[PDB]
Amino acid sequence: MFFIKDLSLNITLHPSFFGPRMKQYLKTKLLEEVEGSCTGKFGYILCVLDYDNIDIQRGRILPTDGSAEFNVKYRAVVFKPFKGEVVDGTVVSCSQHGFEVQVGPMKVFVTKHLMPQDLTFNAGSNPPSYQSSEDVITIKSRIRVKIEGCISQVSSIHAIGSIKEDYLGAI
Amino acid sequence: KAIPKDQRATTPYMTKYERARILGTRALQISMNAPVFVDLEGETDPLRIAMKELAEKKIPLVIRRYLPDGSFEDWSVEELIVDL
Amino acid sequence: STSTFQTRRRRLKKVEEEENAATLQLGQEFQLKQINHQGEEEELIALNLSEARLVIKEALVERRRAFKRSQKKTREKELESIDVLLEQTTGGNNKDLKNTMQYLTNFSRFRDQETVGAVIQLLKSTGLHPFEVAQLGSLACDTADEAKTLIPSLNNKISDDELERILKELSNLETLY
Amino acid sequence: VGQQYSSAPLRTVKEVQFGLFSPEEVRAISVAKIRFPETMDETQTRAKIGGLNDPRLGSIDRNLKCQTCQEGMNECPGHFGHIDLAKPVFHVGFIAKIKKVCECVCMHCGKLLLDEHNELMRQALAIKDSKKRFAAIWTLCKTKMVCETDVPSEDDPTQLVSRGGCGNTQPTIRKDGLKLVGSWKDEPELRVLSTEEILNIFKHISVKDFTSLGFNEVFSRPEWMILTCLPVPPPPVRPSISFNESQRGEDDLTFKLADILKANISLETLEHNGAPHHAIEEAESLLQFHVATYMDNDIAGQPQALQKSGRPVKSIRARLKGKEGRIRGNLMGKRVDFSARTVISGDPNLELDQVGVPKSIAKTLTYPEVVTPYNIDRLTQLVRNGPNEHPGAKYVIRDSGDRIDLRYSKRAGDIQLQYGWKVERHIMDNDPVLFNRQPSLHKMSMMAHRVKVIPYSTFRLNLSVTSPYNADFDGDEMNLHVPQSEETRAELSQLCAVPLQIVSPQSNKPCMGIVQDTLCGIRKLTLRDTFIELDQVLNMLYWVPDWDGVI
Amino acid sequence: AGRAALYKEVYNVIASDGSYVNYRHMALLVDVMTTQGGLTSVTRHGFNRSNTGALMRCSFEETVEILFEAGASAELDDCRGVSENVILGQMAPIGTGAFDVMIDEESLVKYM
Amino acid sequence: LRFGEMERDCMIAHGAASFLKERLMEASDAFRVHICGICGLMTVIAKLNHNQFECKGCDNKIDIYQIHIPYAAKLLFQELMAMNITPRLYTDRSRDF
Amino acid sequence: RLVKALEDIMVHYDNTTRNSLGNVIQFIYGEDGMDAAHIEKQSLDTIGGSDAAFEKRYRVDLLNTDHTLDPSLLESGSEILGDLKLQVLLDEEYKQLVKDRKFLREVFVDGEANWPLPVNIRRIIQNAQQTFHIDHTKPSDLTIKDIVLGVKDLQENLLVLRGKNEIIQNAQRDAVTLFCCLLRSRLATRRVLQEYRLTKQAFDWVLSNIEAQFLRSVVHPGEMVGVLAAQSIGEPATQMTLKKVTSGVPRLKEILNVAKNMKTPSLTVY
RNA sequence: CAGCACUGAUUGCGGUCGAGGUAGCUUGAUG
Ligand SMILES: [Mg+2]
Ligand SMILES: [Zn+2]
Ligand SMILES: [Zn+2]
Ligand SMILES: [Zn+2]
């Protein structure tokens, strides 16, 4: 799943920062505007690999003010989920509707009806949980889900995941 | 397409339009508080300083000359001759 | 934004965007056949957990190093060592990355850039598409029916037996906690 | 420019793809149904009916709302609306092609009247250049008036080959007003080609035929020269105009639409009631009429489609037409800020590159200098000076994007400039400027001078530079434009300055010399016969500012 | 021989007035009218029909009409026309803009 | 005052590229619209506050740009539309040459 | 119209005159690559005059007591009289100036020698003259190789087109030709010594400026030559304030319109 | 750009030059 994609950004520099160590300021800029971002086109851009050889190429000066625009060609590590994907994580929350699991930077939620029959939700339990003849899903317990669908949104991505299928559940 | 430093074919001199625009652009930056690479012998008018920078060929810029077909040749202020 | 090395002349009619699934049909942005900046083709890059834990770290550390070249002028263990390395080379607002280290550090199935190596040399010879070659190496697996089920894109592709061999050896080279 | 940050990227325009609107798109774009012809008055009450101008489109009354897009008047461009017609209608200007089309393809089955099979044809389909590859097709299809079913191939003129078929005679066609007619040849048989019909025959045209004929599969399909849905330009294109309040102000356009609207509904209310078959095409022609005149109005078929008061009306085409109109009038040439004009007079005391600006003008025109350590000092003195003493300024602007009006502000005397703020100051001795005299037909008709602030109300220029702008002082008026960007200036001072203009390329000779007094006199003084004595040879020397101080 | 003629015939109009103009200009006009095939007029009939962009031929004697048949057969504009840009409010590939300018961060360090 | 065609004609002659852009824009119309990277139109519903964008119909939200053009022109376009003509505004060339 | 019809034309970085399509209109603006501003009227001496006068001016024969350079000219002259290896260069010089003559007479049939050309040579010397205080008495110090050999190396540096190949480096010659004729015309050995006593120092000097001032007379990739052209025809069309045939303002219109029915048809026959 | 302000002068009426026509006429250029 996780990825390593080759990307490229464009930053506009205002004359002021036209110093001896500009190369240095660009990079940092590149970082604050990419590390932590989100899109449906790329997923989560988590970290910029190889920091040393980041390409800045020659920068061209706009034409009304003195700013310059550089096309910074970098490389990084990304993560974008998929319907039909199978990943496992840690539960985090739980309620009369299901429990939310966490697969890395992302979170997959599971609907009460999108899990097994014989598994009921217990109200007065504390912390909240679901019980089975043999299973006990709750806070820490590590599960393993199947992402039935992915939904993009602002600065993140979410998904509904079932565990009704086989070989799924907790481990 | 891009052209290699060698095989270059344009005029080795600076077009009156280039220089006019370099002084301009340069000044603008200088007037925007950009850093100056020359000893200001006391000047205060940006275009003045600009002309000074251009006289000590210490302006960090590059003229990309586009050809009819789309390719282009790159020349630095440093390289070009400033006759005029 | 960020632009992804492929320019398709979007002539208005932007209607034909296919679905997504483990049918190996991933966005137009992840064809196995994808281009590298140099201008050449280069197979997709599938990172399996733990295999990423290192890349992130390796280049994250080298960042620390060089971040200073310019300043002169065990489960519950790596969990803290990693927390610091971040609070020194992270944007501090990258809650996404932190949380991505725990996960990446608790669920990792390996720990040596040697073992990981084997995994790779081993796995790669299958001809499997990078996505499989990752999931296969990041998901506990004992029975083919277990893998070829949690990874339906395999089915016809391999042979129940040999896969069982591979799986059988993974758990062997599976480093101990 | 426009103000307010936009988290959007910014690029320039490089390609402009021209095309026609697809009734499907028009519908897609809109945000307003637009079903009522009325303006607003929810029964006299003031606002707007979810009917015409603002059924969600733009806005009036200086109020946010632009489909929550708020921002208000200055920022919210228009938001198109549509208006489902009742029955297809031609497009005033395209009629001509639609005629040229049907003549190029027989109806009933819609397909070319000629193929590779006809030699005189091949040579036509080759011509790569739609524009000509059409007046080639059409020129060889208005003549064929039969939809042949079999043509002799390249073989024997004895052997016959087949393609498609249905020889229903090709009816020659003529333009009678806003409709099309054709006979079908003992004795003729005349009938009227219906819009609805025409559309269909086009709707079936082949994709390979499109192209053969001058079109494009995605940007312009012939089945679009016929209108179905009508896009409604939002207010900003047909702004209101209010005489305070309790009064109208509606733009010519807003009405024409309203006319098309009225003239639409009645042609529908008749298709669901007493529909006297041929007493409808007497009310449909009205729509094709309004919709036609809305766009073009000076049609050849006399009736101008007048409007109460007998004032012709302003078709859209009228707004873009020759000079004093959009294209040539607003885009190719504009009115502009930072300009001035008055009378010129001579002055044998300014250098060549100078120009006398009267304090009055000098106190109005302005330049934006950016506070920098190189001048904080200098600049602050101006801001204090205020906008009444000459060397002064009249507007300080902080990065925050807000204007300080030096002539009012309770902090006028106060203020402490900030490295980065701009200070619009008065033009001062030596601010280069573009000075000109119309008509402009010379490079030199416009040149750059060094400002020199003088008194009295006239632009002062040096004799010699007179023949270039070509001007006398018998009350001739001149123009001046003030630069604005450090880089702009440079452009004037580096290529537009006068000292540069001395030698002229339109005749490889200098285009400036000594004239009148200065000339006539230079001669007298020359003569051998002529001698000057000490008590004056000393004053003369003094006058030359570059004198080495050596008698 | 036509170009020769044409020029000869134009020069004589200016020469009859003691007016003088350096070859090159007239020669350019002569050439412009003569390239394509033979005699192409400096009028709404000729020069303003060629493959030049749309928005250009658009600012001269046939405005609306030209734009109509422009979208009709979906033209495309390069935006190389001086006019084109002016209409757009962008700097034109004109002298000062017949090239680009760039900051070579490299050399931007040797200067210190 | 007026910067007529003839005057334009002149600055083009001098090759005073930038100053011409200055007359025409910064000192007159000068305005900014939001475009779509697909249906090259002025459809975008730029809420410029909470950022939201969109050209439903071309249905976007991601590939949106913004140019700077003379309001006059904005109008020329809008008018050309109400007459059913599509003036597409694209920021990258494809035809090359 | 003259305007709108030529807007988009401008000189490009390859020294080609093109419009907005990319269409060549000229391959070298003006057919010479020179900027209208740097061009004065210069006379081409090599053209007019009796075949006799020509000989007496550019002919030098080191094998004839009456057609050599009196030792009062070239310092090292008495020791050249008769030299045979020289007379071969000295013969090339003449066999060229003559080739020139015939050429020019095939371009300017009128025999008109005054024309617009860059780099005013006449003055370039005049300065060299009083800039080195030359005395028409004492001899020179220019080798006969020196003269004839520098003049050759000079032409090799008057560059318009740069190109690294034949097609271009060929066009180069063309674009310079006429000038060089004027060049050899004035830097003729006889001339360079009997008419304007130049020293080695001086001569060397003249050559450098001719080279420099030339390079400065080229055109700048960037000029909007089209509009320039238009106006240049147009402005002089209003100063028109008015042996019997159609001529003037209405005739010009006749032209541009390319009308078939001109008021005056006429035609001349020889 | 003769002149008016009758219907909205951030523009109608109309005028002059030029072409086109069977004309009981279109406009291209034109404040
Ligand atoms: Mg007068
Ligand atoms: Zn709005
Ligand atoms: Zn048929
Ligand atoms: Zn869109």
Side-chain angles (χ1 to χ4, degrees), chain G residues 5 18 20 66 88 106 136 138 147 155 175 190 208 256 269:
Chain G
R18 304 187 180 192
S20 55
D66 306 296
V88 176
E106 278 177 51
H136 303 289
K138 293 193 172 185
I147 282 185
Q155 302 182 200
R190 234 285 146 54
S208 182
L256 307 169
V269 287

Side-chain angles (χ1 to χ4, degrees), chain C residues 163-175:
Chain C
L163 169 63
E164 209 125 74
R165 273 195 171 187
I166 309 300
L167 283 176
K168 279 183 172 181
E169 273 191 64
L170 284 188
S171 48
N172 276 64
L173 305 138
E174 184 168 7
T175 278

